[PDB]
Symmetry: D2
Subunit: 116 residues, 4 copies
Amino acid sequence: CPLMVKVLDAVRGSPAINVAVHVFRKAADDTWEPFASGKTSESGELHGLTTEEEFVEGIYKVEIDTKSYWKALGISPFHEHAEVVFTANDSGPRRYTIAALLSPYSYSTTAVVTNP
Amino acid sequence: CPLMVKVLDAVRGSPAINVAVHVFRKAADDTWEPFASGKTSESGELHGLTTEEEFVEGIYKVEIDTKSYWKALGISPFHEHAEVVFTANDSGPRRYTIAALLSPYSYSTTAVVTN
Amino acid sequence: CPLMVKVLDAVRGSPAINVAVHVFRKAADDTWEPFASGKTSESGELHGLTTEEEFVEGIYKVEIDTKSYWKALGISPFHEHAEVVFTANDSGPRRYTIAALLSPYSYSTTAVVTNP
Amino acid sequence: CPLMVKVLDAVRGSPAINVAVHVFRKAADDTWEPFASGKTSESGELHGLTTEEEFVEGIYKVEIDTKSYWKALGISPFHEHAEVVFTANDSGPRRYTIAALLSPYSYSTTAVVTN
Ligand SMILES: NCCCCCCNC(=O)c1ccc2nc(-c3cc(Cl)cc(Cl)c3)oc2c1
Ligand SMILES: NCCCCCCNC(=O)c1ccc2nc(-c3cc(Cl)cc(Cl)c3)oc2c1
């Protein structure tokens, strides 16, 4: 429950379905270690990536594979992916929704951070 | 000079050219009075809408005809237009750029207010 | 169920709570008639505005009172409100989520349109 | 000339000034090689990063240090930075403007690619 990703398509006005998402966590030696991955559902949501126990303090990167999404719709987009990089749980455990809104040459991302 | 509008296209990655823009000022009876209008340039910009003397404090509406733009590109849009409504304030900075970034089902707008 | 409004705050990373929302529908004489209104909940969502029977084809305007929201947080924002104007149900009944992401000098809006 | 970065501040309604920006090119071993960097100007712009000859096709990353910017304003930010990753392509248009609009918990970016 502590990390969820939601992806919307600004061209079609719909969830962005079947988008690949890779999460990484910065290690002590400053490299990016693979942490979790998955794909968005029919609702454009990806749940279940991690657990309260596993999701410790750290710097996390959420890489959303926007380029494969657009190419499967016949569009050659600008970006390789959308990356969202952030420190998590620095003030204690929180619940993070990482939302992204996609267009071929543009994206936006926002975080909704809540305290259970 | 005090008011400029800049419009970008998030699908094509380009200025949004030949977009109609109408500006209105709110009247004492709360109706919207036509004030200025134009079409964006090849750089997506619309300059020269008003003057320093004319652009007095008040509530203004900038209406961007996004629907006609998407229709021209053959892409089904959601909005009828994008409307940006704001109060012009003499105390702060003196130049207003109203920027808008367009997608068929989404738009964003920001104000860049400077001296 | 056919019209929902969801509002997020891009400064705090949270739902935008207690935001006033007024919906209007363009009448045959081309004026804006009041249609529904409400305020966002603790989750930043406003449900229950209308019904499948009432929400006929038409041009609708959703006016989100962003200026009162920012002022109560001590911020003097740029916009008077965010307005979202759109034709609804032109191809038959649909389910519309109107989402808005707010900052003091900027907002974005997107629509998620689904077919039940 | 072929690559420019423009950064805006959605809280203050202003250019985002003195923002550090680093550009990287992806190497054959998939590491990120430093390529160019600078700080945005009083207009929020960073010009002169590269040249027509140097800016060959490849995968580029533009990393905008948003966290330091919000720290300077005393506002708690979410992201460590904003990263924009793209392939540069000779067939299409020749000038790339990478624009970004910053809020403490959100950012948006668009590419304006023109001749
Ligand atoms: N009739 C019922 C139909 C319901 C469809 C699903 C409801 N959907 C949301 O409850 C929801 C949740 C987070 C969202 N985050 C954004 C967002 C993100 C960015 Cl980066 C920019 C912008 Cl403009 C919006 O929209 C959301 C919607
Ligand atoms: N005396 C000189 C008067 C100068 C007025 C300022 C002109 N200003 C622009 O030329 C400009 C350029 C790129 C922009 N990129 C955005 C942008 C990006 C995103 Cl991601 C979202 C949104 Cl809403 C906007 O706005 C721009 C404005």
